[PDB]
Write a structure and sequence with these properties.
The structure holds 2 chains of a larger assembly.
Chain A: H1 3-10, H2 14-18, H3 22-29
Subcellular location (chains A, B): Cytoplasm, Cytoskeleton; Cell projection, Microvillus; Cell projection, Lamellipodium; Cell projection, Ruffle
Organism (chains A, B): Gallus gallus (Chicken)
Protein name (chains A, B): Villin-1
């Protein structure tokens, strides 16, 4: 994922995603079908 | 996009758009069918 792709996929920046708890990162990526 | 193209597609200025919450930027670009 490029930085723009984080915005397109998750509606937040790469660094905002990285600020989420681990379980939430895993679940959001689960929801999108990503690994 | 050209300045006038941007205004026609989004109905707002570049600055206004960039100042929106990121989730809303993404949803507007969902709504417009850009991707």
């Amino acid at each position: 994922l490029s930085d723009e792709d984080f915005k397109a996929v998750f509606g937040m920046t790469r660094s905002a995603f990285a600020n989420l708890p681990l379980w939430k990162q895993q679940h959001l990526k689960x929801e999108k079908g990503l690994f």
